[PDB]
Amino acid sequence: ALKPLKTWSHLAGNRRRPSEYEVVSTNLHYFTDNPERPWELDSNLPMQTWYKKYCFDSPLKHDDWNAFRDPDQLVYRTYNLLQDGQESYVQGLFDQLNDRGHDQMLTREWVETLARFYTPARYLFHALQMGSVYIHQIAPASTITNCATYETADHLRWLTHTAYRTRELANCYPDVGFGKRERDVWENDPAWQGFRELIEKALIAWDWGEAFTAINLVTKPAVEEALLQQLGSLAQSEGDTLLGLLAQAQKRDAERHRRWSSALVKMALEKEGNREVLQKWVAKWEPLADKAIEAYCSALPDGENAIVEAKSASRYVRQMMG
């Protein structure tokens, strides 16, 4: 008879009694048990090939990815406690800034800016959702996957805000075509084409390390600094106090996606050769980021300064992880 344990068997001898985070998140993927046959089926199925090539054969190598730990340490239960709070705050804003007819107080000019620069962001935000959900399903450890799981809800969270606010703007201003125009602005507007190319191309990087980098290290800070930092500063200086607040709220989400991205990078550097691997992918993608931040911000009031602030703020995120 083997003795009853103190904790799970994979967590034995750990000094300190494992946390809820550790109990419910660690070492859960099983396809990583047989890299010659990840799935209980013929080893030549397209899906076997897909995981061998885009997960196992990533240039981003580590001996024990299961080692990884979300610094915010998020589990489904603590995720909804956090976000239900943060939604009370934002739905609170919508509810009450409405009561007060905040939407009527905005200028003809700012409305035109909202339709070009603010609403169409439902497409960009959804594409991130898509991006982060691809990371979920190819990452090589359940703790990596989980961080991507919550970020994906965050992404849909942002798409939802924008969706909702777009009706409200269509209700207050029916002749603007809010909720009808966004697709053609997304597809045909020079200001968007920088971002759209980046994110289309990003979404076909199947390698898990490359998807992580393209999406979390290069694309997201650029979307974040451009659509949330820059447009948000503008909103407020321009009387759109709802959006100045909306944006700051979503940036809390982004800051957390940064915190875990940062830890994962911190983790890859324990192993020689990985820094170069990351750097080389950054240097592939960074150009397209610049293209995005230029096409978008330059069309804003005080264009060049926004371009210079965003460029260096998105750069700063990455410098901080080495």
Binding site: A1, L2, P4, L5, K6, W8, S9, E20, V23, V24, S25, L28, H29, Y30, R37, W39, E40, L41, D42, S43, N44, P46, M47, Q48, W50, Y76, R77, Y79, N80, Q83, E87, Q91, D95, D99, R122, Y123, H126, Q129, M130, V133, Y134, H136, Q137, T145, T149, T152, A153, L159, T160, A163, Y164, R167, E168, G179, E187, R196, E197, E200, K201, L203
Partner: protein
């Protein structure tokens, strides 16, 4: 003031755009999307019946967890587990082992649709679905973990699927097939429509009643909460199906559905069947696993299908018959092979149980009754080594379950053999064989437990060596759940 949901919902799912800097097929590779030559625009007709949005989701699901966890903590110190009929304890230990990490893997399954479906409604629904299965896996680890100091068997809530123990293979065989290795559209159908809508929704209900009946409220609450999440993502197959038929792929639609049900049926016949008819106490049983099937599972299928414009599967008739016979097979397998599973199978052939078995399935003692007679004499007579095994049963190469049917008087144990490229496969039923045959390349390469033994993959090649290959060990090795209590009744 807030808007009413109906007013803005559509914009949450108006998310398709025409790519330019890459091509549709690059962004939506057919192996992951399975758009099936149907157009972006025509998938936009995809309309889910049950609608939710981010703020509602996180708000409701916060409540569900406050409940569940508060109850768990409330009852913990009363240690109900310590006294439960071990028919129950076993029922639970088998559930956690077989399901917890598959629930987890389901989030990836959902993750797949969420990225690769051309139907925007589907994409967002799948994101919630994804969050749902994240919960299920997480919660179904946190709960068993309460019990790790009670017995090593509970560690299997976690280990099981990281092993090559027969059940783990049967499990991974089914899930990897339905939900991990299929395109987005395929998944919606084979997992959410066929399995989740088809089976686990009603099973989870049944399991929760049983838990309550048994006096395990912690567990009753658990299963009951999870069950409330099912339809939200289980819905996803319906709209997919409509679009496929409306668009001239009724046959492909048809086929995945046929495959999906059979495989789901077979897994169900070993995981739920034996519990209903043998592990639950005799007084606690509301109906037979067969009564439960017909009433709560099978009519619903015909209902569902007729409404979609599909037909009952070719094998439907056989299926109807097999309700009398399969699970008794499955149960006899497990019990006889008990040291190779991670819980204690309940025999369930005490006299009273035996007449119940006869009432529910007339013709039983004159078939399944026999083998059990011999087993019984053997423990009556002091020779109980003849009730453990000395070989391996033939494993079906499809369901990765033992090939078995009625024996005794009407003995009718058949094997649907097939030779395919100079190798001989074995199939536990017609339907299993046909699954391989319509899609041979999906399976060809694979080897079930017996094949691996037969090839020298299990070393030493005796029974103790197969036990180490399956990560099993004394203390988790399964024995008779009642410690042969039901034996005394024959003497």
């Amino acid at each position: 003031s807030m808007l009413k949901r109906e007013d803005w919902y559509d914009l949450t799912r108006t998310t398709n755009w025409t790519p330019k800097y890459v091509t549709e097929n690059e962004l939506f590779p057919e192996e992951m999307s399975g758009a099936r030559g149907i157009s972006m625009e025509a998938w936009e007709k995809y309309d889910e019946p049950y609608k939710i949005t981010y703020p509602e989701y996180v708000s409701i699901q916060r409540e569900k967890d406050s409940g569940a966890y508060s109850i768990k903590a409330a009852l913990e110190r009363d240690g109900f587990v310590d006294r439960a009929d071990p028919g129950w304890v076993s029922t639970m230990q088998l559930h956690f082992g077989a399901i917890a990490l598959e629930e987890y893997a389901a989030s990836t399954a959902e993750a797949r649709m969420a990225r690769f479906a051309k139907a925007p409604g589907n994409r967002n629904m799948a994101t919630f679905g994804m969050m749902d299965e994240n919960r299920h896996g997480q919660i179904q680890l946190y709960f068993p973990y309460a019990n790790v100091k009670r017995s090593r068997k509970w560690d299997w809530a976690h280990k099981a699927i990281h092993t090559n123990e027969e059940a783990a293979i049967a499990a991974r065989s089914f899930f990897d097939d339905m939900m991990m290795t299929r395109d987005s559209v395929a998944v919606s159908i084979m997992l959410t429509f066929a399995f989740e809508t088809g089976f686990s929704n009603m099973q989870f209900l049944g399991l929760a009643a049983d838990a309550a009946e048994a006096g395990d409220h912690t567990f009753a609450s658990l299963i009951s909460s999870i069950q409330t999440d099912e339809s939200r993502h289980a819905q996803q197959g319906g709209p997919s199906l409509k679009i496929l038929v409306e668009n001239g792929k009724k046959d492909e639609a048809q086929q995945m559905v046929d495959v999906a049900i059979w495989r789901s049926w077979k897994l169900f016949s070993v995981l739920t069947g034996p519990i209903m008819d043998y592990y639950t106490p005799l007084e606690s049983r509301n109906q037979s696993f067969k009564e439960f099937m017909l009433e709560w599972i099978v009519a619903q299928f015909e209902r569902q299908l007729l409404d979609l414009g599909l037909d009952k599967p070719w094998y439907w008739d056989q299926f109807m018959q097999d309700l009398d016979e399969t699970h008794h097979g499955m149960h006899l397998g497990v019990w006889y092979w008990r040291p190779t599973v991670w819980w204690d199978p309940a025999a369930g052939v005490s006299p009273e149980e035996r007449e119940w078995l006869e009432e529910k399935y007339p013709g039983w003692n004159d078939t399944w009754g026999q083998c059990w007679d011999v087993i019984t004499d053997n423990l009556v007579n002091g020779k109980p080594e003849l009730t453990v095994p000395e070989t391996l049963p033939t494993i079906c190469n499809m369901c990765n379950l033992p090939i078995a049917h009625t024996p005794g008087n009407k003995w009718n144990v058949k094997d649907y053999q097939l030779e395919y490229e100079g190798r001989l496969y074995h199939f536990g039923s017609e339907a299993d064989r046909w699954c391989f045959q319509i899609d041979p390349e999906r399976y060809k390469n694979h080897t079930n437990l017996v094949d691996r033994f037969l090839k020298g993959e299990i070393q030493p090649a005796d029974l103790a060596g197969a036990l180490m290959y399956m990560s099993l060990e004394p203390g988790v090795m399964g024995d008779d759940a009642h410690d042969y209590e039901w034996v005394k009744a024959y003497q």
